[PDB]
From Swiss-Prot:
<dbReference type="InterPro" id="IPR036749">
    <property type="entry name" value="Expansin_CBD_sf"/>
</dbReference>
<comment type="function">
    <text>May promote colonization of plant roots. May cause loosening and extension of plant cell walls by disrupting non-covalent bonding between cellulose microfibrils and matrix glucans. Has very low expansin activity (in vitro). No enzymatic activity has been found. Binds to peptidoglycan and to plant cell walls.</text>
</comment>
<protein>
    <recommendedName>
        <fullName>Expansin-YoaJ</fullName>
    </recommendedName>
</protein>
<dbReference type="Pfam" id="PF03330">
    <property type="entry name" value="DPBB_1"/>
</dbReference>
<keyword id="KW-0134">Cell wall</keyword>
<dbReference type="GO" id="GO:0005576">
    <property type="term" value="C:extracellular region"/>
</dbReference>
<keyword id="KW-0732">Signal</keyword>
<dbReference type="InterPro" id="IPR051477">
    <property type="entry name" value="Expansin_CellWall"/>
</dbReference>
<keyword id="KW-0964">Secreted</keyword>
<dbReference type="InterPro" id="IPR049818">
    <property type="entry name" value="Expansin_EXLX1-like"/>
</dbReference>
<dbReference type="InterPro" id="IPR009009">
    <property type="entry name" value="RlpA-like_DPBB"/>
</dbReference>
<dbReference type="InterPro" id="IPR036908">
    <property type="entry name" value="RlpA-like_sf"/>
</dbReference>
<feature type="domain" description="Expansin-like EG45">
    <location>
        <begin position="34"/>
        <end position="103"/>
    </location>
</feature>
Length: 208
């Protein structure tokens, strides 16, 4: 109904998600509080991986904490989260196995601008571009070509994808879950698909 509405569900805990999570957000600091998220809640607004790299404030029987969303919780029911143990311990008893929670999307406790990650295989012909360090969920990414703004499809693996992106620097614009839009420019994509993924610095952030 609204993006920041309270969700009721359950949480278990897991050690997965620090490395190899579905949203390709590595490296994740080993002491970060993180979660995997069920697929229905993940795909808010009909955007795949809408909530990938979002932060959630999660309340359990013992208190509240904030977690970075790094992975899919496969087959997870609506409302359900698979927390890292450092997060789970803060809000419940690990000996219970599974606890009732209430959670909502919150502003990222971060500083600085976006960083972009260009997936391996990317070029001006086909590219997958991830936004990192974003204050709110990224719902939309578009790039400019011949004076037109082209919408990029967000994929399950938390990158936006297009083909035939054109030449020169890539002018992009990002829309958050509140509908705030920021514009940035990324250097030229390679002329042949890259063998390795790489990151490039961004210069903008969603407003407070």
């Amino acid at each position: 109904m609204a993006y920041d509405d309270l969700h009721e569900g359950y949480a278990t805990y897991t050690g997965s998600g620090y490395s190899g999570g579905a949203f390709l957000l590595d490296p994740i600091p080993s002491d970060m509080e993180i979660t995997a998220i069920n697929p229905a809640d993940l795909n808010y607004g009909g955007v795949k991986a809408a909530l990938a790299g979002s932060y959630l404030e999660v309340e359990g029987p013992k208190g509240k904490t904030t977690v970075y969303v790094t992975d899919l919780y496969p087959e997870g029911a609506r409302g359900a989260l698979d927390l890292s143990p450092n997060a789970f311990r803060k809000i419940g008893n690990m000996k219970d196995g599974k606890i009732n929670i209430k959670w909502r999307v919150v502003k990222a406790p971060i500083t600085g601008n976006f960083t972009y990650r260009i997936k391996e295989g990317s070029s001006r012909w086909w590219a997958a571009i991830q936004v990192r360090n974003h204050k709110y969920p990224v719902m939309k990414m578009e790039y400019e070509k011949d004076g037109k703004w082209i919408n990029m499809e967000k994929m399950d693996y938390n990158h936006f994808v297009s083909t035939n992106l054109g030449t020169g620097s890539l002018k992009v614009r990002m829309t958050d879950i509140r509908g705030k839009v920021v514009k940035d420019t990324i250097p030229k994509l390679p002329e042949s698909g890259t063998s390795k993924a790489y990151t490039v610095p961004g210069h903008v952030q969603f407003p407070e």
